[PDB]
Amino acid sequence: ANTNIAVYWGQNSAGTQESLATYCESSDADIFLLSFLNQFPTLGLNFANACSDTFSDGLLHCTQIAEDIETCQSLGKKVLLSLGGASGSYLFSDDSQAETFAQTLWDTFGEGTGASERPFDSAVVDGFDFDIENNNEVGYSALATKLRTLFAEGTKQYYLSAAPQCPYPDASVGDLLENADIDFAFIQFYNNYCSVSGQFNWDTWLTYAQTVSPNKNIKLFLGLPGSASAAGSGYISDTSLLESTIADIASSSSFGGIALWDASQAFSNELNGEPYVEILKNLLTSAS
Ligand SMILES: Cc1ccc(OC[C@@H](O)CNC2Cc3ccccc3C2)cc1C
């Protein structure tokens, strides 16, 4: 597992986004981040065109995504629910509020037995990604830590991740990354000074993993756009640059692989017949 590919799914960056299970059945990706629980602590989900049904109270109710989560899991994929994204319709006032919210997540999305409305029926996520983008850090470390306690009650391994941008420390998930046990850091090396072709600062994140992260086994991911149209800048089509980049970063145990925004883009974008996500997967496997 220096060879994992993580993809965001749910926000249909490419327009042509297919079902979650379609991408799990592909073999080019290992970890799927459902984008997003964009409203909290008062729960709200958004998955663009992939789910429109609701409970009476307006909370999304997503029977096809639920079935696909189960299919994905049977095929050995991990499926995390991603909190946040670009909306900022989310904020904690304090750690206590965020700790209460851990229970809410556990009973709504995990193996908690507390009866609440379950957007994915009896399907159970494999954990949570913290894609916090509003530059407010209150509550996340306490939420993460409480979740770790609750996960012991479950019957499988759960994962927590965060999605910083490359500048260090991150203004939204820096405190989380420094103060809680996190499995994966999906670090965005684009739209920033520290992108791969800018002043690439992998070395800083390595220092973080080795000396700061409460989990010394945290895995770091090279976070990239999945196509030229998936973000404004920092898409890498130069496969020599990708090879050399992977070469440099794969020579520690802290390297986890590559994270992509998003499935729709990375799977549909071809060089020039071959899916971008497949190019990357094979580069990871060669390097290991
Ligand atoms: C329509 C829409 C599309 C994207 C939205 O949020 C997109 C971004 O915030 C994506 N954050 C992820 C976080 C991450 C981690 C590694 C590699 C890439 C990326 C991008 C929100 C809305 C409402």
Side-chain angles (χ1 to χ4, degrees), residues 1 3-288:
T3 56
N4 289 121
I5 293 234
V7 298
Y8 286 87
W9 176 96
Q11 293 297 307
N12 190 23
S13 177
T16 47
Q17 176 181 271
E18 299 186 79
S19 73
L20 171 65
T22 303
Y23 299 113
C24 295
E25 296 159 0
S26 87
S27 178
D28 304 314
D30 309 286
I31 301 163
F32 294 80
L33 309 164
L34 307 179
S35 309
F36 292 109
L37 187 76
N38 69 148
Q39 187 190 277
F40 56 91
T42 308
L43 295 170
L45 293 161
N46 180 308
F47 299 119
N49 53 355
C51 176
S52 58
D53 287 358
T54 63
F55 297 98
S56 290
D57 66 6
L59 177 58
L60 294 190
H61 188 184
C62 300
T63 56
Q64 188 66 59
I65 293 174
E67 288 162 25
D68 292 2
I69 287 164
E70 294 188 350
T71 297
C72 289
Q73 290 162 340
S74 79
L75 295 173
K77 309 311 191 180
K78 309 298 185 181
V79 185
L80 284 49
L81 177 61
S82 184
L83 278 69
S87 89
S89 52
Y90 53 85
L91 197 57
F92 299 115
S93 70
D94 60 34
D95 287 356
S96 283
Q97 187 174 89
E99 289 166 8
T100 294
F101 189 67
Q103 191 73 47
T104 301
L105 288 178
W106 187 233
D107 290 326
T108 301
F109 298 109
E111 278 178 279
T113 57
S116 64
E117 284 180 335
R118 292 186 61 96
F120 311 130
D121 299 335
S122 65
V124 179
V125 300
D126 294 301
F128 306 95
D129 175 54
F130 295 97
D131 183 10
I132 308 315
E133 307 192 350
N134 65 353
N135 304 141
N136 191 291
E137 311 190 79
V138 172
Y140 295 103
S141 47
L143 168 54
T145 295
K146 181 71 169 203
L147 283 168
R148 292 293 182 193
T149 301
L150 296 178
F151 290 163
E153 304 175 355
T155 57
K156 58 175 178 183
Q157 181 171 357
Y158 289 82
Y159 302 87
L160 296 185
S161 63
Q165 299 174 78
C166 60
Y168 192 101
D170 187 272
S172 303
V173 293
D175 182 74
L176 178 64
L177 284 165
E178 285 162 23
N179 290 307
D181 173 9
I182 297 303
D183 299 278
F184 316 124
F186 302 126
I187 307 154
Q188 307 163 60
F189 295 99
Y190 65 96
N191 291 328
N192 282 281
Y193 88 90
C194 37
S195 68
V196 172
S197 72
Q199 304 165 238
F200 180 47
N201 74 337
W202 186 268
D203 49 14
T204 296
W205 287 98
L206 188 58
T207 297
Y208 155 81
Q210 290 179 337
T211 70
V212 180
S213 177
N215 181 20
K216 299 236 150 2
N217 184 59
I218 190 164
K219 298 294 181 205
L220 309 173
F221 286 69
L222 183 71
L224 299 169
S227 77
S229 68
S233 61
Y235 170 65
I236 305 169
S237 56
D238 178 359
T239 64
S240 71
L241 184 45
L242 294 166
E243 276 171 316
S244 54
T245 295
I246 289 164
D248 295 346
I249 67 187
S251 53
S252 78
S253 61
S254 297
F255 176 69
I258 291 173
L260 299 162
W261 184 261
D262 71 358
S264 71
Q265 299 281 191
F267 276 87
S268 68
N269 173 34
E270 251 139 38
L271 311 200
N272 194 211
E274 182 193 342
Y276 187 65
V277 63
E278 193 191 322
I279 287 151
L280 288 172
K281 181 79 172 150
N282 294 335
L283 288 177
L284 290 174
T285 56
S286 328
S288 64

